[PDB]
Amino acid sequence: DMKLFAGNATPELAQRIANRLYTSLGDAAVGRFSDGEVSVQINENVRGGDIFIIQSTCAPTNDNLMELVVMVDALRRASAGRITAVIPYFGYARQDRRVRSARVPITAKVVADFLSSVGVDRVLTVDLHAEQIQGFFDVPVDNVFGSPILLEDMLQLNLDNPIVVSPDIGGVVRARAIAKLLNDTDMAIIDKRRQVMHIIGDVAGRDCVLVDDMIDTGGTLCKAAEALKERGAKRVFAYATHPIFSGNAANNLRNSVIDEVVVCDTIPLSDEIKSLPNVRTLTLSGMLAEAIRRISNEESISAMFEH
Amino acid sequence: DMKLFAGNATPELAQRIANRLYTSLGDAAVGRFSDGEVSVQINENVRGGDIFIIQSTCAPTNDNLMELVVMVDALRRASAGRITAVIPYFGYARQDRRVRSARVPITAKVVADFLSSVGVDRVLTVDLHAEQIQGFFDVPVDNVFGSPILLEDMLQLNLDNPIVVSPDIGGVVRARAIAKLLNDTDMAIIDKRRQVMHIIGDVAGRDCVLVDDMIDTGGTLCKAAEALKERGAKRVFAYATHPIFSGNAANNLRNSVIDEVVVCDTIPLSDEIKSLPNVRTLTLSGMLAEAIRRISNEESISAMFEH
Amino acid sequence: DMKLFAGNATPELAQRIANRLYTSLGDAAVGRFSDGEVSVQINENVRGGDIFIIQSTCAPTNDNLMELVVMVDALRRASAGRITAVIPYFGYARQDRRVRSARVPITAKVVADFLSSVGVDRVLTVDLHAEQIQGFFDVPVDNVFGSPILLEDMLQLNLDNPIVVSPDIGGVVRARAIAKLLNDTDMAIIDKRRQVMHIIGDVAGRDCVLVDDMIDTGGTLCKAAEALKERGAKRVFAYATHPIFSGNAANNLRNSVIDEVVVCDTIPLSDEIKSLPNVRTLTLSGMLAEAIRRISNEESISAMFEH
Amino acid sequence: DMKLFAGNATPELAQRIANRLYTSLGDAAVGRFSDGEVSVQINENVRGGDIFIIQSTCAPTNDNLMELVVMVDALRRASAGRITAVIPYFGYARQDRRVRSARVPITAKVVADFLSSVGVDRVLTVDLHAEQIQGFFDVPVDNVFGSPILLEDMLQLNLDNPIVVSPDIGGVVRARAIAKLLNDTDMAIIDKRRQVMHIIGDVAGRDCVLVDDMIDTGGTLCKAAEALKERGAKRVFAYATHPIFSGNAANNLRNSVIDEVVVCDTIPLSDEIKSLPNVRTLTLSGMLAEAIRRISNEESISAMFEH
Amino acid sequence: DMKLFAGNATPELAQRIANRLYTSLGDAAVGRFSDGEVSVQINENVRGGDIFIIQSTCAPTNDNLMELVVMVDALRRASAGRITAVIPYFGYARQDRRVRSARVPITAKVVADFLSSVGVDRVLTVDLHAEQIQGFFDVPVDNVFGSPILLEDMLQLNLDNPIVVSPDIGGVVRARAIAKLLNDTDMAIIDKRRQVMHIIGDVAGRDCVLVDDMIDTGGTLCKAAEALKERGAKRVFAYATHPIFSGNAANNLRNSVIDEVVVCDTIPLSDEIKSLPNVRTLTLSGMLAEAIRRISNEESISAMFEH
Amino acid sequence: DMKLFAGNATPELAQRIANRLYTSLGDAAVGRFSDGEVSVQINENVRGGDIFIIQSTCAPTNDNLMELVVMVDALRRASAGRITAVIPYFGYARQDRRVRSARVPITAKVVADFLSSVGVDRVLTVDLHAEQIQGFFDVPVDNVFGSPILLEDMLQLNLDNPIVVSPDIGGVVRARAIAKLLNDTDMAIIDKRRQVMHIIGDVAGRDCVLVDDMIDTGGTLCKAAEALKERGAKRVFAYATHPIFSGNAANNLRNSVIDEVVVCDTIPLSDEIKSLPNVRTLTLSGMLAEAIRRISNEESISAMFEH
Ligand SMILES: Nc1ncnc2c1ncn2[C@@H]1O[C@H](COP(=O)(O)OP(=O)(O)O)[C@@H](O)[C@H]1O
Ligand SMILES: Nc1ncnc2c1ncn2[C@@H]1O[C@H](COP(=O)(O)OP(=O)(O)O)[C@@H](O)[C@H]1O
Ligand SMILES: Nc1ncnc2c1ncn2[C@@H]1O[C@H](COP(=O)(O)OP(=O)(O)O)[C@@H](O)[C@H]1O
Ligand SMILES: Nc1ncnc2c1ncn2[C@@H]1O[C@H](COP(=O)(O)OP(=O)(O)O)[C@@H](O)[C@H]1O
Ligand SMILES: O=P(O)(O)OC[C@H]1O[C@H](O)[C@H](O)[C@@H]1O
Ligand SMILES: O=P(O)(O)OC[C@H]1O[C@H](O)[C@H](O)[C@@H]1O
Ligand SMILES: O=P(O)(O)OC[C@H]1O[C@H](O)[C@H](O)[C@@H]1O
Ligand SMILES: O=P(O)(O)OC[C@H]1O[C@H](O)[C@H](O)[C@@H]1O
Ligand SMILES: O=P(O)(O)OC[C@H]1O[C@H](O)[C@H](O)[C@@H]1O
Ligand SMILES: O=P(O)(O)OC[C@H]1O[C@H](O)[C@H](O)[C@@H]1O
Ligand SMILES: [Mg+2]
Ligand SMILES: [Mg+2]
Ligand SMILES: [Mg+2]
Ligand SMILES: [Mg+2]
Ligand SMILES: [Mg+2]
Ligand SMILES: [Mg+2]
Ligand SMILES: [Mg+2]
Ligand SMILES: [Mg+2]
Ligand SMILES: [Mg+2]
Ligand SMILES: [Mg+2]
Ligand SMILES: [Mg+2]
Ligand SMILES: [Mg+2]
């Protein structure tokens, strides 16, 4: 008995996933009270069932997170069998340590503790900001890479001796993995000091593919593209998995030298961003549906990591 | 070493409490990141200290709650000694059971579990919606009544043989307590059936004092006042502790037959409500400051329940 | 594999429930050692089974509670699958908060913690004193109302314009629910001050039905009946779910003006009470058997709340 | 701030301990409600204090145990600093394993879990039935031997080449320890087969000292004394720490060949037993008072194990 | 789906058990990294399976224990259904209490806590040093006696009026059980004082069977055999379950008066010990295989305790 | 009351730290039993004290880890006040996630859970392999960088326009931090594909400083030095914090082109490595002593992160 439930964060992605599983979303009233508190009621029998909840903890982050945890509590008190939280974008993942013992929280651990406390039995995410967040849980956590879809899109561009560039130092590992997958090309690294951007590697007369896990504001992405074009690069493409696009992202991307921005659909796009002519979206519904299928049928999940 | 910290929910109440304790609020940067996630940094040494956090979980409820739990986590990882959460208004307290085994959450228990998980050592609240929420925690919970302040204000009205009325059946116990405190007057009960309001008790030619724990939308309060005046009551006064005032509350209170609405300051008022000429606010800063003083000095807290 | 086990608190109710499920009680030796400590031995295979334990925590309360928790521990170490505690009367439910921060325990929370610690997976009760005790547990708790049986008995009395009266202020909500179920009649409230009883509502020349969750000593019930008859009421009937009947209850009920006392069978009656001519018992075995049937077969439990 | 509290199990022992500490027992109302549920109220400030609760879990075992756990919960919610449970006799200690995987509970572990759940910080006991019960807790457990007092009494008897006998096989280790302390005498062992008692060791023409941790019914003790006298022993003395004396113990001890029965005061004696002419009581109040003194002042507890 | 996995501690015993279950060991790479840290990889699907891990925590104890806990963590994160730890010899079982409140650990409790923390669901052991270690866990623990195999071997020796001797005082209970099983013979006890060995019981002209749970160094066993032969015993046989054989055990057994040493196979023997001509090994693979079979099929485990 | 205790892993480092704190190491017997199990006895009063345990979990890793956890359990049962584990090198830190959902453990989380279970209150480490391991704990974890000491040593070399090189992609962040501290020089990255080493950045005619967190076998370090010298680098220096030096490290470093290897003293060096002429050791005893001093006196720990 596989049952799918959705929040208000990613309803269209949940509908696409349900379509690919040839089922329909479970019936649950999830809204707000008059004063703004989350209201949840499960409107069908879930006793002993195998429940999947699809919801990203994207902006508005706190409302979406409260929605998810309140759904889990409601399902657990209604005697559900197993609850899997499908969280395509995991919010608060960038607050994952205390640098220099700064008096800051580790909020990703706080969220993992909340999810474990309400009774989640498994978590399925896409491209966690830090892979070590798998260890913040006691339950199995499956971190699925979005790189197959993005690489499939890259290979249909016919790039001229492309080079893979990471816009910052934190993305070097991911950029190297993408480069090894992309016909084993070269990689370059953007190094930022003091306000100048230093490029390590040769980009003269080559197509540049900027790869990142997310695009939050686009300031550093636009600056990296500007530096790459100033050092003589033909075309610049930006590939990311999570389209956060917060703050002044639309204006930054509009007045930029990037030829194409390609993102996945873990977060719904705004009308502001969708109006842009050079922003393209790929879908992860098939990959997530296959992962849900394998989890539900007790099959091996390692098959999801092939290109 | 008593240190006070405040969130963004009730900063002026926290400042008043700090003034009455002859100290100043601790220095902590509490704001938002670009995408809307809560940002917290404690900017002073708190090692081994006795920390009090003042913040209501009022609207926007989820942001305020996340702010509180993230502050507690940051303080606990910074080696604070004891953390007391002063929550003048406790949000989600109305979701306290599952009626008829409805597939709903018990969200007050979820919030209590979150607070216990991040490391709170004591909770101090004002007029919990259900007193049994004290049992949702393992830590001491002090539920302080706001009835001394409201009764002091009532006794300066010179009411003509007043009668204490509860606007619904859930408030009968509180209304009876207020009536016994108010020179041992009579009490009447509003009974609602089907859309008509039935009044049990005699209100003909008497001043009526409606007492409630909160005013959320004011619809039932205005209806009760209308019924009381239709059964021949001279003047109607509304007394409450928590001024939620959500939805259409301002228009409901403007076009109403209530002579005076008196509330406490557990939730800041909007400009919409503050423009109203017949809404008056009492302060709880002295009572909360005395409670904090007694907790900090290891004195008996039972002295707080005298009129 | 549904297996029923019984303690020494309510053996005849357990036998009736087993009869209605067309099974027999499981074989377990549950007694005392020489010095009075509880002795338990499960005398059949329970590995992987779906176990229901039927036992009220009624007087002697502590022995019955220890019996229940020791049974649960014995079954859990014998590799039982799922353990449901059917507790028709939940003892210690009246100690559910600390009024005015009195240095008292919250013993209902203590008992819930004990039950959760030994390994109970679900609780099924009848008419909890406070519904918020559902939140004292992490496991599902089904609070089943006894009002269908009592209302069925009420409707066979042919009352003359009956009015529903709550003997105290704590029972107003339940009395209102019963009144709305009883052809939508009126309700009156007994208000006690200082030693006099004040009645809010008109009872002149009407049949009065006193409704309560329990009858502990009968002092307040007899006083309320006396006041109702003094204000000119034709007949007084007392309806309750839990027949505790402690202290001087038999003498109070014998020298009283109540025409009929009707109770359920969550607690066995003594010979003292059974000798009384105007005390009648209704059975809850059918309702509890249906609830157990629905829990065992993973059906919806919401069907149990219809009249 | 050392505060002593007592239950209703061992009030005179608690008073003696308080006398030896030159303090007085703390003021707390500990009784029963009308229906038999435990009632507790702490009538003094205990905030931040160092609390000791003196109560044996002796017969009636379940009432005493519930009294203790309810006291601990009340003190913990009243913000006590540290709670030490002084349990001179630990009930349910004989149910400490499952022999041959019998479907029985391990009730000593259940009681340890209850005590840990309510918030006990340290346990102090006398002559635990199994020393491994120390490992049933997470908190420090100090198991103090009563053998110094009993050995002091033995050495004032002027025994004629005494031999130390264990009435069963479970007491051989304790009997050997006593024998090594008693001028390094010999030891004999009572072996019971099938209904006959086999004695291993020579007892012809010697004084026999039977040593045990407890005397529950006295049947095996009287049988062992009978066998020892039949194999030609001059005088038989019985020494034990815990005087349970359940069932037919008084008649067994009256019609027995034992010259003297000496016990400690961990359990109050009945009038039935106190009427016996050959039963003598030693006091442990000094030893327990010294242990409490050392725990309170953060001194080494190893000094308590010298003769 | 029963799956067997083995560590590096007892691979041949695991292979024998797998042979008797007519299955094969599961495929898992369990070794060491370059620096000596344990490396584990499960090389087959275990989702929802019923997993048994066979590994003794014998010398090198800490490596074997870490191997076991790391395997359990790997299997739990791979979504295994139920994990049973089959630990034929349980290391650290001799550190089971704090005698005289010595500042020592209770390491058996530490190991039980580690096993419970990684997610073990059941433990199956052979001849625990202290049976109360069953209470150190929350999960079912089945302590299976090795006495059937040893008694079967004893009865094929044709002993001349044998007497069962325990080499120390801690083994008296086990020696008595063996004696009652061995045609209800007599038992004698070795008592050690100061450096001399005192024998309680008559051994003149009888065959002596020394029975113990383990043989660690053999010093006390050889001394007991020497004393027994000095008091005129014909032949001395040593029977034990766990062949630890540490330190100078081989030289002690070589220069000893023991005619035969018979042990089980819970710990692999060294070449040093296997070279000895009078050391014989019995197998427990059949008994453990039957226990695993009964656990897997949800049958009663009490059938394992018959001779 | 600050008390220092040491294991057998890093006794000389512990002695140096004790010397810099002008105290002496606490008296505790920490060794092995005959069969190889860890033996611990605390030989002084620690009641209420502030205890620091200094021990790296270096090779033999499992013995050292068991030593640490057993010490913590012994101290916690002896009523210690606060226990801080000073672990200069944290073993198992490289097993921090499951790549591609490989059926592997997260052993760093297992070790963190063990430490939290025995009762550690704070952890102090040096240069954790992954900083996110701070989130594997609930307690404060202070990750102190060793870069001040190494940078002080670097600045006394008089390098000719040095360039900072990371031997692999996982060390790029640390290499960049070191480069920014080292007069804001340039950085180069070693990229390994397929067996060839690709260098991103210009190293022609410059001094190269290889920086890493650890040196396990030295194979990749020697290969990186060889590649750097083949692309025309004057001198190559290797700087690391943790000198693991496992496997064939001594032969790799002997037959290498590295001019100097400088490491800290978190792990004792072998005689094999100490015989090498171009391996130099720096001490961290002063920095760790200052950190312990600040923790003990409740001072801010942020002062430890300045150069
Ligand atoms: N403001 C208030 N003051 C006093 N009691 C209150 C108040 N609000 C709610 N209550 C509840 O009303 C109940 C009345 O109990 P109490 O005041 O002791 O009188 P009695 O027990 O005689 O009815 C208490 O249990 C308390 O929890
Ligand atoms: N026997 C009963 N039947 C129905 N409700 C009851 C009963 N006893 C107590 N109650 C409580 O009375 C409250 C009345 O709510 P409800 O019956 O939904 O009507 P309304 O919400 O319109 O007042 C419920 O929250 C329920 O918890
Ligand atoms: N009253 C007692 N005094 C001393 N030991 C006792 C007593 N009762 C039981 N014992 C147990 O007897 C065992 C004997 O150990 P010990 O007295 O150290 O001598 P040895 O170790 O030489 O046999 C101890 O482990 C202790 O737990
Ligand atoms: N020795 C070190 N000194 C400083 N930072 C280090 C060191 N080793 C690793 N790091 C990491 O490098 C990251 C660089 O951040 P930071 O030094 O604040 O500069 P920026 O944030 O401008 O890149 C930090 O998050 C820190 O965790
Ligand atoms: O917020 P921006 O820097 O503009 O863009 C998002 C980046 O911030 C984080 O490093 C993310 O990993 C991205 O690299
Ligand atoms: O939301 P409204 O009914 O308009 O006003 C608030 C009321 O709703 C809850 O019962 C509260 O206790 C109040 O009585
Ligand atoms: O103990 P009595 O007051 O005599 O009768 C039982 C009552 O006490 C509690 O309020 C129960 O709810 C009943 O109303
Ligand atoms: O119950 P009885 O056997 O008569 O006397 C008490 C004995 O029962 C237990 O073994 C105790 O340890 C005693 O040896
Ligand atoms: O270590 P040894 O004394 O030489 O032989 C093992 C004995 O040590 C323990 O008591 C075991 O139970 C054995 O009796
Ligand atoms: O084991 P080696 O690769 O030879 O040297 C140690 C390296 O292995 C890990 O990445 C460490 O971080 C080091 O970079
Ligand atoms: Mg990052
Ligand atoms: Mg980035
Ligand atoms: Mg309500
Ligand atoms: Mg209301
Ligand atoms: Mg009540
Ligand atoms: Mg009542
Ligand atoms: Mg025993
Ligand atoms: Mg005995
Ligand atoms: Mg032993
Ligand atoms: Mg032994
Ligand atoms: Mg790494
Ligand atoms: Mg590396």
Numbering used by the authors:
A (entry chain B), B (entry chain E), C (entry chain F), D (entry chain A), E (entry chain C), F (entry chain D): 3 to 196, 203 to 315
Give passages from the manuscript.
PRPP is synthesized by PRPP synthase (PRPS), which catalyzes the transfer of diphosphate from ATP to ribose-5-phosphate (R5P), thereby generating AMP and PRPP. Phosphate ion (Pi) is necessary to activate class I PRPS, while ADP, an allosteric inhibitor, competes with Pi and ATP at allosteric and active sites, respectively. In both models, PRPS hexamers are stacked in rows to form filamentous polymers.
In the type A filament model, R5P and ADP at the active site are in association with two Mg2+. One Mg2+ (Mg site 1) coordinates the C1, C2, and C3 hydroxyl groups of R5P with D170 and two water molecules, and the other Mg2+ (Mg site 2) coordinates oxygens of the α- and β-phosphates of ADP (active site) with H131 and three water molecules. ADP binds allosteric site 2 in chain A through hydrogen bonding with R102 in chain B, and S149, E133 in chain A, and a π-π interaction between F147 of chain A and adenine bases, and salt bridges between R102 in chain B, R178 in chain A, and phosphates.
